[model samples]
Target: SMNPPPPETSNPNKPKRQTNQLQYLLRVVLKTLWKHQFAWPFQQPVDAVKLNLPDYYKIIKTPMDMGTIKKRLENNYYWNAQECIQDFNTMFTNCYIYNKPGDDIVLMAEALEKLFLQKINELPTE
Candidate 1:
């Protein structure tokens, strides 16, 4: 009797390597947000001790920033466009919560948030 060998499975990463328009758009939008002057304060994690706002950790449970968002996108952490968009929203929300309304930082967050909303329409979809 002759025995046949088992069939080989296909590689999952094959299709994943293809260029995705959605991913490209997301990268462009994220870069735009990151390069904006208003994004300076939100470029990296806030220093609680340096800023002397130790309560920052208590108020913002999930602190987000442009640098972190870009890192996640580069690492393929987001499952969809909406997930990436939500991170930006989270960053802005954290700012709004930590700073007083009409304050300089809050105003910067508001401007960046508006710019993000405008850019979201450019996404092709999930």
Candidate 2:
């Protein structure tokens, strides 16, 4: 979600098939996260405690928009956000390749959100 994905190019010869490593990792990560159980991310947002993980409900009904998080994270100022996102990429990749019953992906993402959310505040309010 944070790393963000891509679409195809207009040129037929180019054939926009290129994908980043994180894309593959996140696939399996989601395969496990939404496999059979209900991940907290799919839950509804609360007015009292919103996406402002380390803070209060500041983003309003953002509804766990990881896309927004990625947009906000375009700023390289927040090292914590970058690391946390990278950590998820590697963690999910490892789990997908070497780990089993690694249903903990959701919990990890849920926990990791706060790191991004906390640092995201330092970014533009746009």
Candidate 3:
């Protein structure tokens, strides 16, 4: 029989890595040092517990309020949206592209959106 060909490879210089939801969650955790943030003692005062990204992602992928997220973060002291995205970039670069992670342009931008909306909701009149 003829020898099988090797699998095709993506461009080495590309900046992003494709991943499923589970891998994304793991990437977020590893990149943010979330395990440490969640373990931080400050979380207890907020009455929060660490929330795995996979679980949080499922809950918040669609439109949701910051109060909801803030409540979770304040309580858990876990991966905030910003932290999750920051770590995501790091994980992608370190593990996928085999280069130093540059930045999570998408996530950072989205975090700002989320933060702005969250702050709006927190306004005293609202």
Candidate 4:
């Protein structure tokens, strides 16, 4: 009943979601809600959404969901990572007890950018 997230994977070529892979879903939430340079920002592809509109930030939510952030911005940019780190104070406010070092979206994004992303990508692209 928890509806937990799937284990996060940086592999864009990966298949659909998995129940056991909750953390991956969490990773997707963190990664997509925010962006990192030299990184795709989302695991799912752009062509999948194929929307043409404006103001993706207004369209997108806490987690970087592809369904809504489809409208391309200037220069045909579908998504853009915030220049500043996300303030997750409210994010951890109620969920303080469940907080992990990686729970912070900023922390998650950085780890993926600096380390975990590399590790995940090294895995077989199945």
Q: Write the per-residue lDDT of candidate 2 for residues 13-87, one digit (tens) a residue.
A: 432222332332233332344333434442222223233343322322113333322322332212333432553
The best candidate in terms of TM-score: 1
Question: lDDT for every model?
Answer: 0.70, 0.34, 0.32, 0.32
Point out the worst 10-residue segment of candidate 3 by lDDT.
40-49
In the predicted model 2, the residue pairs found to clash are none
Global local distance difference test of model 2: 0.34
Deviation from native of the Cα of residue 67 in model 2, angstroms: 7.7
Per-prediction TM-score to the true structure, in the order listed: 0.79, 0.26, 0.18, 0.20
Comparison by TM-score, 1 against 3, better one: 1
What are the per-residue Cα lDDT tens digits for candidate 3 across 11-121?
334344323422433443322333332223211221112332233233322222223333333343333344434433332232223212454533433444344344434
**Model 1 spans > 4 angstroms off:** 1-22
Summarize candidate 4's per-residue lDDT along 1-126 as a digit string, tens digits.
122242232334534332322333234534444454423433332221344323332333233322223221111231113211122222222223222545654454444444434533333322
Error of 1 at 25 (Å): 4.9
Residue 15 error for model 3, in Å?
Answer: 33
Clashes of each: 0, 0, 2, 12
Off by over 4 Å in 3: 1-75, 96-126
Q: Name the TM-score of candidate 2.
A: 0.26
TM-score leaderboard ranking: 1, 2, 4, 3
- Listed per candidate, the RMSD to the true structure in angstroms reads 13.0, 14.7, 19.2, 15.8
